[PDB]
Design a protein around this motif. Structure first.
Motif, PDB file in Angstrom:
ATOM      1  N   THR A   5     -17.110 116.964  43.541  1.00  0.00           N
ATOM      2  CA  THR A   5     -18.382 116.503  42.997  1.00  0.00           C
ATOM      3  C   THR A   5     -18.551 115.005  43.237  1.00  0.00           C
ATOM      4  O   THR A   5     -19.616 114.556  43.670  1.00  0.00           O
ATOM      5  N   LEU A   6     -17.484 114.228  43.030  1.00  0.00           N
ATOM      6  CA  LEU A   6     -17.531 112.795  43.317  1.00  0.00           C
ATOM      7  C   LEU A   6     -17.767 112.531  44.806  1.00  0.00           C
ATOM      8  O   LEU A   6     -18.569 111.662  45.179  1.00  0.00           O
ATOM      9  N   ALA A   7     -17.088 113.284  45.674  1.00  0.00           N
ATOM     10  CA  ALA A   7     -17.318 113.141  47.106  1.00  0.00           C
ATOM     11  C   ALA A   7     -18.792 113.314  47.446  1.00  0.00           C
ATOM     12  O   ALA A   7     -19.365 112.538  48.230  1.00  0.00           O
ATOM     13  N   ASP A   8     -19.439 114.317  46.852  1.00  0.00           N
ATOM     14  CA  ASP A   8     -20.854 114.512  47.136  1.00  0.00           C
ATOM     15  C   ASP A   8     -21.693 113.377  46.565  1.00  0.00           C
ATOM     16  O   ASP A   8     -22.661 112.941  47.200  1.00  0.00           O
ATOM     17  N   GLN A   9     -21.334 112.875  45.376  1.00  0.00           N
ATOM     18  CA  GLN A   9     -22.082 111.762  44.788  1.00  0.00           C
ATOM     19  C   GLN A   9     -22.057 110.538  45.690  1.00  0.00           C
ATOM     20  O   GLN A   9     -23.037 109.782  45.756  1.00  0.00           O
ATOM     21  N   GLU A  29     -20.923 106.437  58.660  1.00  0.00           N
ATOM     22  CA  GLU A  29     -19.483 106.304  58.615  1.00  0.00           C
ATOM     23  C   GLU A  29     -18.897 107.213  57.532  1.00  0.00           C
ATOM     24  O   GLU A  29     -17.807 107.760  57.698  1.00  0.00           O
ATOM     25  N   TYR A  30     -19.626 107.440  56.439  1.00  0.00           N
ATOM     26  CA  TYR A  30     -19.109 108.345  55.414  1.00  0.00           C
ATOM     27  C   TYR A  30     -19.170 109.789  55.898  1.00  0.00           C
ATOM     28  O   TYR A  30     -18.264 110.585  55.612  1.00  0.00           O
ATOM     29  N   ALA A  31     -20.200 110.146  56.663  1.00  0.00           N
ATOM     30  CA  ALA A  31     -20.257 111.508  57.209  1.00  0.00           C
ATOM     31  C   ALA A  31     -19.117 111.762  58.198  1.00  0.00           C
ATOM     32  O   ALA A  31     -18.544 112.863  58.248  1.00  0.00           O
ATOM     33  N   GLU A  32     -18.748 110.750  58.971  1.00  0.00           N
ATOM     34  CA  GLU A  32     -17.593 110.873  59.843  1.00  0.00           C
ATOM     35  C   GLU A  32     -16.306 111.036  59.022  1.00  0.00           C
ATOM     36  O   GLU A  32     -15.466 111.905  59.300  1.00  0.00           O
ATOM     37  N   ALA A  33     -16.175 110.257  57.949  1.00  0.00           N
ATOM     38  CA  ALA A  33     -15.026 110.391  57.065  1.00  0.00           C
ATOM     39  C   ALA A  33     -15.003 111.755  56.399  1.00  0.00           C
ATOM     40  O   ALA A  33     -13.931 112.372  56.250  1.00  0.00           O
ATOM     41  N   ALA A  34     -16.165 112.254  55.977  1.00  0.00           N
ATOM     42  CA  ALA A  34     -16.193 113.578  55.379  1.00  0.00           C
ATOM     43  C   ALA A  34     -15.704 114.636  56.373  1.00  0.00           C
ATOM     44  O   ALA A  34     -14.962 115.555  55.998  1.00  0.00           O
TER      45      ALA A  34
END
Length: 126
Positions: free
Chosen positions: A117-121, A5-10
């Motif tokens: 950077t936070l998004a990747d974390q 779900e986070y990859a879809e949001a990304a």
């Protein structure tokens, strides 16, 4: 999973980045009809991204994933900074204030670049 779900949001976030850069080119070229349409598209994209992010945060909370919750609280707070600047940009366009539109556009770019950077974390924490 919450991670997918986070990859879809990304991906939705990257769609807004793409549309935003096209919109910036149209603004610089004075194609206000295109800008209006891109701003509508961005509003819908930000509304969808915001909802996916809230579902992800609520799920991390239900899962007890304390680190992911911390990072998503920080990230959702920065998202709201971007949304407020975006809404001010839309108002500047409505009002014909190109000076303010340029200001808000640069600010939205810097706020977004900071948050990466936070998004990747978060991807790694979920």
């Amino acid at each position: 999973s919450v991670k997918s779900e986070y990859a879809e949001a990304a991906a939705v976030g990257q769609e807004a980045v793409a549309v935003f850069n096209t919109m910036k080119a149209a603004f610089q070229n004075g194609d206000k009809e295109a800008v209006a349409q891109y701003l509508a598209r961005l509003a819908s994209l930000y509304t969808r991204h915001e909802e996916l992010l809230n579902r992800i945060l609520e799920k991390a909370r239900r899962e007890g994933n304390k680190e992911a919750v911390t990072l998503m609280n920080e990230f959702t707070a920065t998202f709201q900074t971007g949304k407020s600047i975006f809404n001010a940009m839309v108002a500047a366009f409505k009002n014909g204030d190109d000076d303010s539109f340029e200001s808000y556009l640069q600010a939205l770019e810097k706020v977004t670049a900071k948050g990466e950077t936070l998004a990747d974390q978060i991807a790694k924490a979920l």
